[PDB]
Amino acid sequence: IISLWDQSLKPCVKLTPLCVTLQCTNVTNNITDDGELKNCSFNMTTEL
Amino acid sequence: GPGQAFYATGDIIGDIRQAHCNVSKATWNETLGKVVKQLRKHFGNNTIIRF
Amino acid sequence: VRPLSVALGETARISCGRQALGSRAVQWYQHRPGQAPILLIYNNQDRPSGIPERFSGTPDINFGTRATLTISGVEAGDEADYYCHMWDSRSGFSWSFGGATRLTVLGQP
Amino acid sequence: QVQLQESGPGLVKPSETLSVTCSVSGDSMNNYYWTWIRQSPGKGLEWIGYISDRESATYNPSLNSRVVISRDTSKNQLSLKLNSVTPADTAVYYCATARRGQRIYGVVSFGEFFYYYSMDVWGKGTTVTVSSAS
Ligand SMILES: *[C@@H]1O[C@H](CO)[C@@H](O[C@@H]2O[C@H](CO)[C@@H](O[C@@H]3O[C@H](CO[C@@H]4O[C@H](CO)[C@@H](O)[C@H](O)[C@@H]4O)[C@@H](O)[C@H](O[C@@H]4O[C@H](CO)[C@@H](O)[C@H](O)[C@@H]4O[C@H]4O[C@H](CO)[C@@H](O)[C@H](O)[C@@H]4O)[C@@H]3O)[C@H](O)[C@H]2NC(C)=O)[C@H](O)[C@H]1NC(C)=O
Ligand SMILES: *[C@@H]1O[C@H](CO)[C@@H](O[C@@H]2O[C@H](CO)[C@@H](O[C@@H]3O[C@H](CO)[C@@H](O)[C@H](O)[C@@H]3O)[C@H](O)[C@H]2NC(C)=O)[C@H](O)[C@H]1NC(C)=O
Ligand SMILES: *[C@@H]1O[C@H](CO)[C@@H](O[C@@H]2O[C@H](CO)[C@@H](O)[C@H](O)[C@H]2NC(C)=O)[C@H](O)[C@H]1NC(C)=O
Ligand SMILES: *[C@@H]1O[C@H](CO)[C@@H](O)[C@H](O)[C@H]1NC(C)=O
Ligand SMILES: *[C@@H]1O[C@H](CO)[C@@H](O)[C@H](O)[C@H]1NC(C)=O
Ligand SMILES: *[C@@H]1O[C@H](CO)[C@@H](O)[C@H](O)[C@H]1NC(C)=O
User: Fold this and answer.
1) Is the beta carbon of B46 within 6 A of some atom in ligand 5?
2) Do residues D36 and D48 lie in contact, with contact meaning Cβ atoms separated by under 8 Å?
3) Does the N terminus or the C terminus of chain C have fewer Cβ atoms within 10 A?
């Protein structure tokens, strides 16, 4: 199962450029939330 | 990418709730009790089983 | 203030600018000039006592339609400031009554 | 019958206090919640704050906490105090009840509901003018 799991992820997408400094703010909610939803905006390298 | 797309979570449409899992209390009580009756076999004739 | 005009003996729809971000529970208020306002429709489905059946509420279908107050058979006394007291699970506490669509009736004898 | 009658000064100078009462009759005081309503000429009906049976005054944040509201079961009337009053406060002052309905969208055990306040019974309303006039 472990070896069969990796062979299903290798052809998938890699997210190494994903985690940049994320300006995460709490989602549009009221008091008595718990968090658990971070609205993160970040710079991402496009196609070019 | 070129041609590599990070599927991200967009705006959540609708009401904001949290996930849960329901389990019939009538069955779960009865199920655990059936286990204690079997679990009491391996520890004394009668002992207090705590979950 | 949002102006709107309708003819006599016709049916009208009253909407507000706010959108139902999530599950909504709107209250409808009809403020006659000088006279005290009166709640017409609340809970999206219920009409308090002492109110004509000319107004029907907009039920909740988890999405889609906003607070659309359906005025069936508009009368002369319906010329007033209509308020859309909207409440939802996203905006939190609605400490404001929002912009009132002042509906006026034209073509009357 | 629930009769909400308001009485106030009517005229007031700037930087003063507007203390207007609201008498309720034909019913009890501990049945529902109470509030005031204001509306400036040209603006819409704005909410100033509401009080429940536990006397805890909750104010509208759109006025920078420049209002103090309270009620007295002795006179069975609803009081309302405003400090640092601006000339723009010349408006009509309504008085209405508040039926706090509980609208549920998720589960109750996780606190996935919310209380919406509904003004069912209103009052006639009294107008006050604030300016440098005497
Ligand atoms: C495991 O067990 C728990 C406990 O039983 C389940 O919890 C329940 O989940 C349901 C579904 O999420 C909740 O439903 C909502 O309930 C309110 C209140 O109505 C009653 O509430 C009691 C609890 O107080 C409940 O026992 C009753 O069965 C019943 O539900 C409803 O008003 C609400 O209606 C709808 O709300 C959605 C919100 O998005 C809305 O889109 C939809 O249109 C409905 O709107 C109503 O209101 C509008 C006006 O605004 C009106 O026009 C409509 O006609 C509707 O009246 C919804 O049904 C329930 O509260 C919750 N509580 C409990 C303790 O039961 C749990 O679901 C279950 N398992 C899983 C896996 O979920
Ligand atoms: C988390 O934050 C993001 C960024 O603020 C929120 O997304 C953005 O939400 C606004 C509305 O609040 C969108 O603006 C509108 O977009 C439409 C697009 O057609 C436009 O016609 C309107 O004039 C207006 O500009 C905005 O597009 C949207 N996205 C971006 C990239 O800014 C997001 O909604 C927040 N999370 C939640 C769940 O609210
Ligand atoms: C994307 O990159 C730009 C580069 O300028 C970031 O912009 C700066 O962000 C900081 C923090 O918010 C501000 O103090 C600066 O004034 C911004 N500069 C300019 C010219 O706008 C931007 O924040 C980045 N976005 C994210 C969220 O990664
Ligand atoms: C905002 O983010 C902080 C830090 O993650 C969290 O403690 C808080 O509960 C979030 N929400 C609110 C309503 O402040
Ligand atoms: C799950 O949902 C099905 C369909 O409503 C129901 O028959 C079953 O009893 C539910 N199970 C639990 C754990 O509530
Ligand atoms: C749980 O269910 C079983 C079977 O009905 C019963 O024997 C037992 O006493 C129940 N336990 C409790 C704590 O109710």
Assistant:
1) no
2) yes
3) C
